[PDB]
Design a protein around this ligand. Structure first.
Ligand SMILES: O=P(O)(O)O[C@H]1[C@H](OP(=O)(O)O)[C@@H](OP(=O)(O)O)[C@H](OP(=O)(O)O)[C@@H](OP(=O)(O)O)[C@H]1OP(=O)(O)O
Lengths: 13, 67, 73, 45, 49, 134
């Protein structure tokens, strides 16, 4: 959940 | 293919109702039927021999029967 | 067994014995009524590089393999 | 003496029949796998 | 069930010394191709496994 | 971090965002559109043709034992060799990837990874993916 938000942040921009 | 002649009749309508009605506007009363009459006579000129062959085959199926 | 192969053909003797009915067909109308007559340094890091008809079978042909590689992607 | 035409796909008259009436390599794979084992040995060495 | 147990044309009997010593050479040659080894032996795949 | 950045479709973008990042990166190279000194830029697109139809399972097994536990790699090379039935015919698919497998994406990327290393070479691929720690 923390990891997934960091993954979406890296994936977005 | 009657639609061809039907379109032509409609097209003749669309000419004749705006040369018959320059100062008349809109309404029935137009009766210059000559070129649409010519169009349907030319249709009959085309489908005299068509109907001769079709009805000849039909009437010989009625009397003589199917080959 | 209501559907069967063909043993022999419907012979034209059976069509020559029948008397005709006159059904003027749409194609036997007179047309072509005249017979014509004749007269009488940057690439040295990799592992590969330049530094280092007809057959009769149709399924086995070249064109059919070109076809199937064209139309199955 | 032509055989009596038994096939798999269409049994037209519903006959049952005796069951048998219904129904090597290039060297190069030895060239590949051995060589791959050789390369694997070199990798492990 | 047909193509692996009830088809009589492929062999279920015990293998010779030749067939074991070539099936080890095939399982080194064709590593995890058991349908391919089955086609080469004309034998059931799970039986050869 | 098995797959490098250049392998796509990665999970970081939709394919239109892939196209947009690709155009941006084409623009954002240092002096790429300059033709004053007589440079030349070349963009090449080609199909790795029939890449899933000519994978050899001996080679594929030895490639996959490098990355996974060999029980999984034996499973994968034994799963890509099954019978292809159809209505009438049937054949043992002796080599070549069956794309309809669920994990056949991974092999189609991983074998494709090998082709990238055969195209980029070693050194430039080390330049593209960067170091492993970053
Ligand atoms: O619906 P409109 O676009 O306004 O056209 C109509 C329509 O002509 P169209 O057949 O081209 O549509 C009428 O034809 P029908 O509805 O009867 O089929 C026709 O009336 P008549 O055929 O009875 O003469 C009438 O012409 P008008 O009302 O002037 O007599 C004419 O209107 P427009 O002259 O404005 O085109």
């Amino acid at each position: 959940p923390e990891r997934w938000e960091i993954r979406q942040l890296i994936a977005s921009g | 293919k009657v639609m061809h002649q039907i379109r032509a009749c409609k097209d003749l309508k669309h000419i004749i109702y705006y040369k018959f009605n320059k100062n008349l506007g809109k309404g029935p009363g137009c009766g210059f039927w000559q070129p649409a009459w010519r169009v349907w006579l030319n249709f009959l000129r085309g489908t005299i021999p068509l109907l001769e062959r079709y009805i000849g085959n039909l009437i010989t199926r009625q009397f003589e029967g199917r080959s | 067994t209501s559907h069967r192969p063909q043993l022999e053909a419907r012979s034209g003797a059976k069509a020559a014995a029948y008397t005709p009915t006159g059904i003027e067909h749409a194609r036997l109308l007179p047309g072509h009524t005249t017979l014509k007559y004749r007269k009488f340094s940057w690439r040295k890091g990799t592992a590969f590089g330049r530094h280092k008809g007809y057959i009769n079978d149709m399924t086995k042909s070249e064109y059919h393999q070109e076809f199937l590689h064209k139309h199955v992607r | 003496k032509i055989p009596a035409a038994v096939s798999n796909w269409k049994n037209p008259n519903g006959y049952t029949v005796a069951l048998e009436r219904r129904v090597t390599i290039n060297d190069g794979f030895m060239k590949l796998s051995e060589a791959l084992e050789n390369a694997d040995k070199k990798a492990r060495q | 069930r047909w193509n692996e147990y009830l088809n009589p044309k492929l062999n279920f009997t015990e293998f010779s010394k030749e067939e074991d010593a070539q099936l080890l050479d095939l399982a080194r040659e064709l590593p995890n191709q058991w349908r391919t080894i089955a086609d080469m032996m004309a034998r059931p795949a799970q039986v050869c496994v | 971090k098995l797959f490098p950045n250049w392998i796509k479709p990665s999970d970081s973008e939709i394919p239109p965002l892939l196209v947009y990042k690709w155009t941006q990166g084409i623009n954002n190279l240092s002096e790429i559109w300059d033709v004053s000194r007589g440079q030349s830029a070349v963009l090449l697109e080609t199909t790795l043709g029939e890449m899933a139809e000519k994978i050899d399972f001996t080679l594929l097994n030895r490639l996959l034992r490098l990355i996974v536990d060999p029980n999984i790699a034996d499973y994968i090379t034994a799963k890509n060799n099954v019978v292809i039935n159809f209505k009438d015919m049937s054949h043992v698919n002796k080599y070549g990837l069956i794309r309809g497998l669920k994990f056949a994406s991974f092999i189609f990327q991983y074998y494709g990874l090998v082709i990238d290393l055969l195209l980029l070479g070693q050194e430039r691929a080390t330049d593209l993916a960067g170091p492993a720690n970053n």
